[PDB]
Amino acid sequence: MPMQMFMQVYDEIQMFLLEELELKFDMDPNRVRYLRKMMDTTCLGGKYNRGLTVIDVAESLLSLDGARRKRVLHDACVCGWMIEFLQAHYLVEDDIMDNSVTRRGKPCWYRHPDVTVQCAINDGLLLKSWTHMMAMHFFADRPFLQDLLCRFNRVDYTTAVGQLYDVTSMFDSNKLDPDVSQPTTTDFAEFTLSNYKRIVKYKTAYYTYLLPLVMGLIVSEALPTVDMGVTEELAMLMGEYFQVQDDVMDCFTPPERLGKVGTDIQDAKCSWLAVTFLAKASSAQVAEFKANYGSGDSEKVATVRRLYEEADLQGDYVAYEAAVAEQVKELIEKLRLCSPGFAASVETLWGKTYKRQK
Amino acid sequence: MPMQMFMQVYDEIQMFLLEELELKFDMDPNRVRYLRKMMDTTCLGGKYNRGLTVIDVAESLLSLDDGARRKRVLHDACVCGWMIEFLQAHYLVEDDIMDNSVTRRGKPCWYRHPDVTVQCAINDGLLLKSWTHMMAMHFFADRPFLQDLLCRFNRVDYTTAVGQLYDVTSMFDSNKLDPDVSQPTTTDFAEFTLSNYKRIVKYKTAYYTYLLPLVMGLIVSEALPTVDMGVTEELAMLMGEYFQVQDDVMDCFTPPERLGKVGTDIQDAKCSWLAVTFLAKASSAQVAEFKANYGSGDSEKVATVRRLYEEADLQGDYVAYEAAVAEQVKELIEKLRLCSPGFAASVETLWGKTYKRQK
Ligand SMILES: CCCCCCCOc1ccc[n+](CC(P(=O)(O)O)P(=O)(O)O)c1
Ligand SMILES: CCCCCCCOc1ccc[n+](CC(P(=O)(O)O)P(=O)(O)O)c1
Ligand SMILES: [Mg+2]
Ligand SMILES: [Mg+2]
Ligand SMILES: [Mg+2]
Ligand SMILES: [Mg+2]
Ligand SMILES: [Mg+2]
Ligand SMILES: [Mg+2]
Numbered sequence: 020m021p022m023q024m025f026m027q028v029y030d031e032i033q034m035f036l037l038e039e040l041e042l043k044f045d046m047d048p049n050r051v052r053y054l055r056k057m058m059d060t061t062c063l064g065g066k067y068n069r070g071l072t073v074i075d076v077a078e079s080l081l082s083l084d085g086a087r088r089k090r091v092l093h094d095a096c097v098c099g100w101m102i103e104f105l106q107a108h109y110l111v112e113d114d115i116m117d118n119s120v121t122r123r124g125k126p127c128w129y130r131h132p133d134v135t136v137q138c139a140i141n142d143g144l145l146l147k148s149w150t151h152m153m154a155m156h157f158f159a160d161r162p163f164l165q166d167l168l169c170r171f172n173r174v175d176y177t178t179a180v181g182q183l184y185d186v187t188s189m190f191d192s193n194k195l196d197p198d199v200s201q202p203t204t205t206d207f208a209e210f211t212l213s214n215y216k217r218i219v220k221y222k223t224a225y226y227t228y229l230l231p232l233v234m235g236l237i238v239s240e241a242l243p244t245v246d247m248g249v250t251e252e253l254a255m256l257m258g259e260y261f262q263v264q265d266d267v268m269d270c271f272t273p274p275e276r277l278g279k280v281g282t283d284i285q286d287a288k289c290s291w292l293a294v295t296f297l298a299k300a301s302s303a304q305v306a307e308f309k310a311n312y313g314s315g316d317s318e319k320v321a322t323v324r325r326l327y328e329e330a331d332l333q334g335d336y337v338a339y340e341a342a343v344a345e346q347v348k349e350l351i352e353k354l355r356l357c358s359p360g361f362a363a364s365v366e367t368l369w370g371k372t373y374k375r376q377k
Numbered sequence: 378m379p380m381q382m383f384m385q386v387y388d389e390i391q392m393f394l395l396e397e398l399e400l401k402f403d404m405d406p407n408r409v410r411y412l413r414k415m416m417d418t419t420c421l422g423g424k425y426n427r428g429l430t431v432i433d434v435a436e437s438l439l440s441l442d443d444g445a446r447r448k449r450v451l452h453d454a455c456v457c458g459w460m461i462e463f464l465q466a467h468y469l470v471e472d473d474i475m476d477n478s479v480t481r482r483g484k485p486c487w488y489r490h491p492d493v494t495v496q497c498a499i500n501d502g503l504l505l506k507s508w509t510h511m512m513a514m515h516f517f518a519d520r521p522f523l524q525d526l527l528c529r530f531n532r533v534d535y536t537t538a539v540g541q542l543y544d545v546t547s548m549f550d551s552n553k554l555d556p557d558v559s560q561p562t563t564t565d566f567a568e569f570t571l572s573n574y575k576r577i578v579k580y581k582t583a584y585y586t587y588l589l590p591l592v593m594g595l596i597v598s599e600a601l602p603t604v605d606m607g608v609t610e611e612l613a614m615l616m617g618e619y620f621q622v623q624d625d626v627m628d629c630f631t632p633p634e635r636l637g638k639v640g641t642d643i644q645d646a647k648c649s650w651l652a653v654t655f656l657a658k659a660s661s662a663q664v665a666e667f668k669a670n671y672g673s674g675d676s677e678k679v680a681t682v683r684r685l686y687e688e689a690d691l692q693g694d695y696v697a698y699e700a701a702v703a704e705q706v707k708e709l710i711e712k713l714r715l716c717s718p719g720f721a722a723s724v725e726t727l728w729g730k731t732y733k734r735q736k
Contacts, residue, residue: 044580145539165523198490
């Protein structure tokens with residue numbers, strides 16, 4: 020049911036956007052078709068966990084005429100597409116920044132045979148523009164519209180700042196200077212857990228966890244009813260854990276299962292694996308890592324992977340997850356006390372996250 | 378005076394942005410410093426024509442005042458002025474990447490800076506646009522016009538992105554546009570028409586460069602409905618097209634030391650005004666020579682393209698285009714003057730900064 024009404028709204032959104040282009044933007048059938056294809060390829064094919072979370076949060080809150088349930092759930096569907104379109108935008112641009120090769124089982128957008136890198140940058144930016152155009156059209160008469168967009172934009176800003184932390188994490192920040200080139204860091208002194216937690220809170224947690232929850236509360240007209248301090252705590256914790264999972268899968272999960280090929284080693288990413296290895300590694304192991312990290316060469320990449328599993332990273336990961344599960348379990352209860360329905364949706368979202376194989 | 382106040386507001390905006398980053402976004406001093414230099418390098422050093430137009434429009438409609446209104450309206454115009462300047466900073470960072478340009482305002486392009494990676498350049502560009510919204514929400518939090526301002530700003534942004542699509546695909550046979558299948562640069566140039574040129578330029582340039590500063594100037598001075606918008610838009614579209622025609626001509630013939638940037642249109646195979654105007658008047662032999670030399674980095678080939686443009690008397694065509702434009706502009710400004718004399722004057726001022734620009 021929820022996937023069926025979501026996909027119906029997708030066609031609703033797609034039709035508005037593409038007809039507007041024909042009718043008001045002097046667009047030709049060839050480019051309209053190109054953009055329809057761009058939209059489908061970049062926005063569909065995933066699990067829709069972000070978008071679906073908005074629907075479930077809204078559905079969980081309708082109580083605390085059947086025309087209202089219809090309206091609230093349709094609003095949740097549009098908001099769900101706002102986040103999925105936003106992540107579509109993120110993934111198109113990120114795939115360029117990360118020099119990735121596949122995504123969701125297909126080439127990355129920028130790697131598509133007739134998509135130029137210059138068009139791909141623009142296509143990715145069209146995706147974000149669509150998030151605002153859909154909000155403005157579908158929520159024109161909603162009083163929550165300003166708050167919604169104010170919050171969406173702040174989250175987007177936050178993610179961009181997080182992306183900056185990600186993309187500059189392998190350069191000595193003391194030597195960060197537009198006028199002067201600098202190679203990848205050689206001492207990895209900034210590959211700390213503290214610096215890792217910052218990247219991840221900003222690049223992943225706000226838009227992946229907080230935003231779907233907040234938008235669900237908004238379309239429900241239920242935002243002031245919850246503990247937003249507790250709610251943000253949960254989002255940050257779940258979001259960090261989600262990204263630790265992503266980093267671990269990048270290295271250890273066969274690409275066929277994930278739909279994408281991992282680039283973190285090659286890109287010299289400040290991943291969870293890297294910070295946790297270096298914090299506990301002997302000097303000899305750190306030497307090996309340094310001589311093999313941030314290179315395309317497959318044997319060097321295999322050597323890093325070898326180092327990770329020799330330093331018992333799976334030991335650290337099981338213990339991390341248990342510590343997270345513990346704190347998550349506790350915070351949901353704090354939430355349950357005053358917001359039983361919302362806590363239930365958060366609990367469902369956790370169920371989607373804990374020990375995911377994705 | 379306009380520049381004095383404008384530049385004071387720049388520091389105000391910069392301080393809000395960078396201190397929020399430090400206080401609320403856990404940013405370290407090194408990256409605060411990176412961002413400060415990115416902001417200054419990408420947003421400063423131009424002519425600020427878009428931004429200063431917002432101030433001029435507002436200052437013109439400032440008659441319809443004990444000083445408190447004036448103080449507020451002019452500060453709001455300065456903030457909107459920077460919104461557009463920061464939006465343009467965003468466009469230029471990403472556009473220089475897309476267009477494979479080398480220099481900008483006499484410096485390397487942002488993405489060409491020794492310590493800026495292409496991947497950071499892309500994100501930096503995106504941060505510049507985020508900043509337009511953040512400064513709006515901060516300075517205009519309590520303004521009734523906020524929602525309307527943000528709505529129009531956003532539509533114009535999207536319009537410009539659509540125009541950029543037109544620009545970047547204009548050298549690809551659109552019938553064969555297909556993500557799944559590779560395709561080379563057009564060999565027949567069948568789509569290098571004036572009709573397609575006018576659409577690229579209307580969307581990529583006219584809306585944000587001419588319409589938006591005027592509209593914003595009117596919004597902050599609370600005078601938007603006082604103006605014939607049909608005529609205003611007509612004016613913006615005409616001036617905006619002519620501005621881009623000037624940009625295309627300068628790309629080919631103006632030395633880069635005066636430009637500040639090295640032209641790429643011939644090399645990138647852009648559907649420029651020169652190209653479409655040349656193709657529409659050229660003999661078969663000329664067109665054949667054009668086809669053999671356009672869209673190449675080769676210094677000899679670009680030189681041949683420039684010569685063919687000279688041989689075709691495009692400089693003559695330009696003078697007549699410019700005269701046709703200037704006549705319509707003058708007439709439309711008079712149409713405006715009848716019921717909007719103050720706004721009409723600010724539009725005259727804008728045209729004056731446009732007409733026969735050396736740039
Ligand atoms: C213009 C730049 C947009 C700014 C925000 C881009 C954010 O992109 C993000 C944020 C979080 C995760 N991801 C994708 C993850 P992926 O493993 O799905 O590529 P990554 O962090 O390992 O690269 C992309
Ligand atoms: C990545 C998404 C960006 C969205 C739209 C950016 C549009 O950029 C534009 C629009 C008009 C003029 N310019 C700069 C001009 P330039 O001669 O200063 O490079 P160009 O049109 O000849 O490339 C850039
Ligand atoms: Mg990535
Ligand atoms: Mg990434
Ligand atoms: Mg990843
Ligand atoms: Mg361009
Ligand atoms: Mg350019
Ligand atoms: Mg140009």
